[PDB]
Design a protein around this ligand. Structure first.
Ligand SMILES: [Mg+2]
Ligand SMILES: [Mg+2]
Ligand SMILES: [Mg+2]
Ligand SMILES: [Mg+2]
Ligand SMILES: [Mg+2]
Ligand SMILES: [Mg+2]
Ligand SMILES: [Mg+2]
Ligand SMILES: [Mg+2]
Ligand SMILES: [Mg+2]
Ligand SMILES: [Mg+2]
Ligand SMILES: [Mg+2]
Ligand SMILES: [Mg+2]
Ligand SMILES: [Mg+2]
Ligand SMILES: [Mg+2]
Ligand SMILES: [Mg+2]
Ligand SMILES: [Mg+2]
Ligand SMILES: [Mg+2]
Ligand SMILES: [Mg+2]
Ligand SMILES: [Mg+2]
Ligand SMILES: [Mg+2]
Ligand SMILES: [Mg+2]
Ligand SMILES: [Mg+2]
Ligand SMILES: [Mg+2]
Ligand SMILES: [Mg+2]
Ligand SMILES: [Mg+2]
Ligand SMILES: [Mg+2]
Ligand SMILES: [Mg+2]
Ligand SMILES: [Mg+2]
Ligand SMILES: [Mg+2]
Ligand SMILES: [Mg+2]
Ligand SMILES: [Mg+2]
Ligand SMILES: [Mg+2]
Ligand SMILES: [Mg+2]
Ligand SMILES: [Mg+2]
Ligand SMILES: [Mg+2]
Ligand SMILES: [Mg+2]
Ligand SMILES: [Mg+2]
Ligand SMILES: [Mg+2]
Ligand SMILES: [Mg+2]
Ligand SMILES: [Mg+2]
Ligand SMILES: [Mg+2]
Ligand SMILES: [Mg+2]
Ligand SMILES: [Mg+2]
Ligand SMILES: [Mg+2]
Ligand SMILES: [Mg+2]
Lengths: 127, 157, 197, 106
RNA sequence: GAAAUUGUUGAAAGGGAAGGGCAUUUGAUCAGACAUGG
RNA sequence: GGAAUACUGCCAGCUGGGACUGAGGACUGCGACGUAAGUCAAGGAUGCUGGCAUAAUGGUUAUAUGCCGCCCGUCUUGAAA
RNA sequence: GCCCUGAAAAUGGAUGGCGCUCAAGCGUGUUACCUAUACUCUACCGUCAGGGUUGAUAUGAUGCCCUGACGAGUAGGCAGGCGUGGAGGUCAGUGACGAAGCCUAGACCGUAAGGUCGGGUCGAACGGCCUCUAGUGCAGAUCUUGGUGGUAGUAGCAAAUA
RNA sequence: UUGGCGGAAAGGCCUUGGGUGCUUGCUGGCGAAUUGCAAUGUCAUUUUGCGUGGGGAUAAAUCAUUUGUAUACGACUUAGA
């Protein structure tokens, strides 16, 4: 139900955690580039963590596609949904986390009608 | 809205292929493979069985027969790349082998009475020719297997 | 190519047998070495006695227990050469070495099992003639090995038995010859000959 | 038929490697009876298989297979190189491996 | 009602630290389907 | 005296085995084979066949195994110190 | 030439180790073989350069497209972005049928800063986009305040008659 | 099942007399397919729980107490039906 697209190649799936985020609690995994004068990481000694750089850039084509084949589009309500009325093999809808249980049936319904895909059906669902 | 709408959106036409330039040319078999040459099947259901080459079908495969009464192997298809063509060979002049082709094997559980009959026709001639030479029949019934310190990379076959 | 491989340690050169044995293990071969006492080291006795004594004088100064251990018997003199050629501190290594067994004199199971030699570690084949070498047992006894005498006793006693065994066997094949003849030049005989047999 | 075997017996020696850095992506294999590059050419292309066991039975069988193929020769002594679909375990160094006759060109 | 730190329960690992990188075994876990005639 | 052969070099000579890749997506270019209709390996892979369904495959995680990896920050010609 | 003497230092130890004697030593020659983030071909990311293209022709002209080359980096310069408190404008945006927050070896997107979702917990608020503005991003400063560890059920709780 | 031999870790070896399955030394009569052209197709041995039935055996150690050949605490050494 989505376009052709080449094989989605990811090319560095692992996460890129900040150096020594595993060493001290106070240090969060969120990346931060090592600046220090000595650092093995900043200097790239064999055996250390890899750092983000632009060569890991994803294929411009397959970029942004979720496994399905669609760029996901965050959808708050039915008006928001209907922007995806044509572009169905292109986009799919993510229903906003803060959307009340009741309204999700309505968005779910309208999308089934319009043939638009929903990335997270059975959101606030009663089962 | 939860997220601003994109300004572009692609087209949802899916383009045509480019006029490829590959063309199915025929496949000449390797010189060891001549009709009536004894084959050693290397893979599959009948691995290790010795077996008589018959014809080279249109889907690149080799018509094979055994014969059935000799060692349970039917008139069958087998891939050329999974067979050791042996040095030994039985004559196959008086065997019909015409009716067999791709469509003949085309799966339409329960074996047809045709197949069972064709087997007998083809076999009776082969077993006729086989029996001429001593121990060719017994050989044909025994299964091939590498013994200790067989070096295939310079064994003969 | 053999579940286990028994090697008659005799007339082999330590380091070279060690080197071959050690690669065998790393490749998954089970090796068991017998008669380590009758194993050789190039260079005359006095030399290698001198050497062992240099090995001897090293030990953790503050606690001789921690420091290097000085095994004396031939089997373990050889195990040292061997272990030195394995990455023995890694999982892989520990495994390699657990495929090895090293005895002096050949002691049951293997008493009746066939042993082999390793040509490329065969002293006679290897050393230039005239060149002085060392017998490992003499070296060992010389640096403290207690059991040369006993191994000698048990070995002789075994060689006795093994003789009556071989003598029986060498005679059985006499009998096999008496009936070999009657068929030796039968018809299938000449027929098998055709095909190289 | 005491014997049933249609593969040549082989060992798994190593990953491809320098002195101090290894490459899990290629695997070095020792094929029984093969002693030279000349010889080991015969088995190029052939299908290797590491066969192992497991507790959790999958296909009704508790036996599993890692497939791959011989790709080129190695060194001067009949040793040979292989890629497998998924790189071999490394605990397998010195384990037995199976070298097949297909794809046959005999 | 966060974190440090802690009790319990559950899984696991542990021959003189722990933690990391590439790779795969093994166990656990999570996926992307899309639709054809009765 | 008449030859071979080695060595070296050339062929827009023929040919077997193995390996990695298959980017592109109507046509358009340069050609090649054809007496022609037309065909082609000629501006990037197609064909045939099979397998997977409380599964093949893949992501994550834990562990094991091979190789590899000293503590960051700082001043400093020089810091794992 | 090689070998021997000349040749004496303090923990036990170092052709890297094992060990090697027609070498696994020394001199020389000849082949094969192993291996870098380098070289060759190819994919993809980015950067720079050169072009093509809105004539009327559904949704990006700062855009689409074709081609070539290139990529180390401290101090440092510049660019493009991520994120926070508050302000103008707009989605007649989300929400007690559950806002925000918090928990989660569950899921997705991005090279990344981060973004999105599910499940649990919660209970009154809160987002996106264009713009404005700054008391706007922490691992360190023997930094500030607070809170908590190992040390550790440990040192110890023995002067002064009972 | 009859004899023997084996203590280096013998735990195995030789031998006697039958019984019994097979025997490809040889000659016959059947069977094999459709597992569809490879995947994926002999199952080896460790333990550990239960289950059947057969043979078989019917103890101590520690705490506490006690000795002082012992002892910082544990430990040691004695003693108690
Ligand atoms: Mg520096
Ligand atoms: Mg509502
Ligand atoms: Mg051809
Ligand atoms: Mg038969
Ligand atoms: Mg020696
Ligand atoms: Mg020594
Ligand atoms: Mg001393
Ligand atoms: Mg190491
Ligand atoms: Mg004895
Ligand atoms: Mg290598
Ligand atoms: Mg409270
Ligand atoms: Mg699934
Ligand atoms: Mg040429
Ligand atoms: Mg393509
Ligand atoms: Mg998996
Ligand atoms: Mg290291
Ligand atoms: Mg640090
Ligand atoms: Mg200074
Ligand atoms: Mg520093
Ligand atoms: Mg002096
Ligand atoms: Mg020196
Ligand atoms: Mg010199
Ligand atoms: Mg030299
Ligand atoms: Mg030189
Ligand atoms: Mg040289
Ligand atoms: Mg590279
Ligand atoms: Mg740069
Ligand atoms: Mg911003
Ligand atoms: Mg933003
Ligand atoms: Mg803000
Ligand atoms: Mg403020
Ligand atoms: Mg956590
Ligand atoms: Mg909430
Ligand atoms: Mg309230
Ligand atoms: Mg702004
Ligand atoms: Mg500030
Ligand atoms: Mg802080
Ligand atoms: Mg700090
Ligand atoms: Mg207390
Ligand atoms: Mg106290
Ligand atoms: Mg006091
Ligand atoms: Mg007092
Ligand atoms: Mg019967
Ligand atoms: Mg296969
Ligand atoms: Mg007392």
């Amino acid at each position: 139900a989505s376009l052709p697209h080449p094989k989605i190649v990811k090319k560095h799936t692992k996460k890129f955690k900040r150096h020594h985020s595993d060493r001290y609690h106070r240090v969060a995994e969120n990346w931060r580039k090592q600046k220090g004068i000595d650092s093995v990481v900043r200097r790239r000694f064999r055996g250390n963590i890899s750092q983000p750089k632009i060569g890991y850039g994803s294929n411009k084509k397959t970029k942004f596609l979720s496994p399905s084949g669609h760029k996901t589009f965050l959808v708050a309500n039915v008006k928001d949904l209907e922007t995806l009325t044509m572009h169905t093999k292109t986009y799919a809808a993510e229903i906003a986390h803060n959307i009340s249980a009741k309204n999700r049936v309505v968005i779910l319904a309208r999308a089934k009608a319009l043939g638009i895909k929903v990335t997270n059906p059975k959101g606030r669902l009663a089962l | 809205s939860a997220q601003k709408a994109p300004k572009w959106y692609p087209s949802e036409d899916v383009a045509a292929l480019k006029k490829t330039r590959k063309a199915a040319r025929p496949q000449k078999l390797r010189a060891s493979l001549v009709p009536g040459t004894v084959l050693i099947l290397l893979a599959g259901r009948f691995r290790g069985k010795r077996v008589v080459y018959l014809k080279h079908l249109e889907d690149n495969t080799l018509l094979i027969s055994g014969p059935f009464k000799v060692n349970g192997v039917p008139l069958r298809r087998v891939n050329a790349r999974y067979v050791i063509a042996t040095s030994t060979k039985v004559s196959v002049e008086g065997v019909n082998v015409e009716k067999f082709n791709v469509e003949y094997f085309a799966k339409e559980k329960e074996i047809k009475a045709e197949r069972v009959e064709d087997q007998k026709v083809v076999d009776k001639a082969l077993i006729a020719e086989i029996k001429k030479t001593p121990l060719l029949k017994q050989y044909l019934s025994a299964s091939f297997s590498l013994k200790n310190g067989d070096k295939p990379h310079m064994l003969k076959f | 190519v053999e579940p286990v491989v028994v090697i008659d340690g005799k007339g082999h050169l330590v380091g070279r047998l060690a080197s071959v044995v050690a690669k065998q293990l790393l490749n998954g071969q089970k090796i068991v070495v017998v008669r380590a006492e009758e194993l050789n080291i190039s260079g005359e006795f006095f030399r290698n006695k001198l050497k062992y004594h240099d090995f001897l004088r090293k030990a953790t100064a503050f606690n001789k227990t921690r420091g290097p251990f000085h095994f004396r018997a031939p089997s373990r003199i050889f195990y040292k050469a061997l272990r030195g050629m394995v990455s023995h501190k890694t999982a892989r290594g520990k495994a390699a070495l657990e495929r090895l067994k090293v005895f002096e004199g050949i002691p049951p199971p293997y008493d009746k099992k066939k042993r082999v030699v390793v040509p490329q570690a065969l002293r006679v084949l290897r050393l230039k003639p005239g060149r002085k070498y060392t017998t490992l047992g003499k070296l060992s006894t010389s640096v403290g090995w207690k059991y040369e005498d006993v191994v000698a006793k048990l070995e002789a006693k075994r060689k006795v038995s093994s003789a009556e065994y071989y003598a029986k066997k060498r005679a059985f094949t006499k009998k096999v010859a008496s009936a070999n003849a009657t068929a030796a030049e039968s018809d299938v005989a000449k027929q098998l000959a055709a095909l190289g047999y | 038929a005491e014997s049933h075997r249609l593969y040549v017996k082989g060992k798994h020696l190593s990953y491809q490697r320098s002195k101090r850095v290894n490459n899990p992506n290629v695997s070095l294999i020792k094929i029984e009876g093969v002693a030279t590059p000349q010889d080991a050419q015969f088995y190029l292309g052939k299908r290797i298989a590491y066969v192992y066991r497991a507790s959790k039975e999958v296909r009704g069988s508790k036996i599993r297979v890692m497939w791959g193929k011989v790709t080129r020769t190695h060194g001067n002594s009949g040793v040979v190189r292989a890629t497998f679909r998924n790189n071999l375990p490394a605990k397998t160094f010195g384990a037995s491996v199976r070298i097949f006759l297909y794809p046959s060109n005999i």
